[PDB]
């Protein structure tokens, strides 16, 4: 990725089709409204930043919340959370726990350097393990691609699931499409490299899933916008509740897409393509289904690696 522009809240340039690759998508200082986000110190547990919609999801508000520690707010999680995410642990490692404030809320924690980042969202799978050998017994790559997208579509219920594949020069192709009936096909159509730009592809090699639950949903800011640990922007690259590039949201809206989700197909640490999903209406894929998709993305990743790197016999 080319060196990123400062974010808008630090007086950075407006994003246009000419400057694309340098939008700092990983630091929008805001999240998507269907969840809440705290950041806490990785040693003390003191909550530092807090998305200002946190009231809606946590009972007590930013007026009486950013003081006290994680030890006091999540007393039965804090110990396990620390052991799970030790200092130096990799970015994409995450602690999960379902818990009910007065119910049922999904907690996802990960650490960046010395910051713990906590995502909260409402919540309450084997139909995968069945269509498992359909993937295994697929004759070739095209057949593996169609099985993959049909399978995702059955789990998720999404209107359109595609398998997007990157050429050496970074331009993509929709090599498989499973879709609601009546839609004009993308299957076989090719798109410029800039449609998923270098910085995004890169964020997408080490953060395998990302979504826009609602394409016409205002991002809610973190307060304060900067990490008080550092006085710099907060990395949200690994926070699924991360606010999406407003530019990409426009492109989604133009396609009539209310909800978007993609998962990365990585072959040998090098981004192979994406399972890309569209849905006509705003939709929050539940955390359990997202977990099933991350898993499917890893398996599909390895199935692609053996099937494609044996298009030799
Ligand atoms: C720099 C301006 C941009 C132009 C012009 C553009 O086309 N994209 C631009 C910026 C970004 N795109 C981002 C993500 C992204 N783009 C796509 C593209 C497609 N989706 C489709 O369905 C099809 C064809 C049928 C195409 C070509 C995808 C799949 C993704 C990411 C995955 C997803 O949202 O599903 C992006 C990053 C977004 C983010 O913040 O995560 C930017 C900045």
UniProtKB/Swiss-Prot annotation:
Changing residue 277 to A: Binds PCB (in vitro), but has aberrant spectral properties. In the N-terminal section; belongs to the phytochrome family. Changing residue 248 to A: 100-fold reduction of chromophore-binding activity. Residues 22-90 form the PAS domain. Residues 140-304 form the GAF domain. A tetrapyrrole binds at residue 20. The lineage of its organism: Bacteria, Thermotogati, Deinococcota, Deinococci, Deinococcales. It comes from the Bacteria. It comes from Deinococcus radiodurans (strain ATCC 13939 / DSM 20539 / JCM 16871 / CCUG 27074 / LMG 4051 / NBRC 15346 / NCIMB 9279 / VKM B-1422 / R1). Contains one covalently linked tetrapyrrole chromophore. Lacks the cysteine conserved in plant phytochromes (at the position of Met-247) that binds chromophore. An engineered sequence used for X-ray crystallography forms a thioether link to biliverdin through Cys-20. The natural sequence can bind phycocyanobilin and phytochromobilin in vitro, but the identity of the natural chromophore is unknown. This is Bacteriophytochrome. Photoreceptor which exists in two forms that are reversibly interconvertible by light: the R form that absorbs maximally in the red region of the spectrum and the FR form that absorbs maximally in the far-red region. Also has a slight blue shift for the far-red maximum. Could also absorb green light. May participate in regulating pigment synthesis like the carotenoid deinoxanthin which could protect the bacterium from intense visible light.
């Amino acid at each position: 990725p080319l060196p990123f522009f400062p974010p808008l809240y630090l007086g950075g340039p407006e994003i246009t089709t000419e400057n694309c690759e340098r939008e700092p998508i990983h630091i929008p200082g805001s999240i998507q409204p269907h969840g809440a986000l705290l950041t806490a110190d990785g040693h003390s547990g003191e909550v530092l930043q807090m998305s200002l919609n946190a009231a809606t999801f946590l009972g007590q508000e930013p007026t009486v919340l950013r003081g006290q520690t994680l030890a006091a707010l999540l007393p039965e999680q804090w110990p396990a959370l620390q052991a799970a995410l030790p200092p130096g642990c990799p970015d994409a490692l995450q602690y999960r726990a379902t818990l009910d404030w007065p119910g049922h809320l999904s907690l996802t924690v990960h650490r960046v350097g010395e910051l713990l980042i906590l995502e909260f969202e409402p919540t309450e799978p084997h139909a995968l393990r069945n269509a498992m050998f359909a993937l295994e017994s697929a004759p070739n790559l095209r057949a593996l691609a169609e099985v993959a997208t049909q399978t995702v579509r059955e789990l998720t219920g999404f209107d359109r699931v595609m398998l997007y594949k990157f050429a050496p020069d970074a331009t993509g192709e929709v090599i498989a499409e499973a879709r609601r009936e009546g839609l004009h096909a993308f299957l076989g159509h090719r798109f410029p490299a800039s449609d998923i730009p270098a910085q995004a592809r890169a964020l997408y090699t080490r953060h395998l899933l990302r979504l826009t639950a609602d394409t016409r949903a205002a991002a809610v800011p973190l307060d304060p916008v900067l990490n008080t640990q550092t006085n710099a922007p907060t990395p949200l690259g690994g926070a699924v509740l991360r606010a999406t590039s407003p530019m990409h949201m426009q492109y989604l809206r133009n396609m009539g897409v209310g909800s978007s989700l993609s998962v990365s197909v990585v072959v040998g640490g090098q981004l192979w393509g994406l399972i890309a999903c569209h849905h006509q209406t705003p939709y929050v894929l539940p955390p359990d289904l997202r977990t099933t998709l991350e898993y499917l993305g890893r398996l599909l990743s390895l199935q692609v690696q053996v099937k494609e790197a044996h298009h030799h016999h």
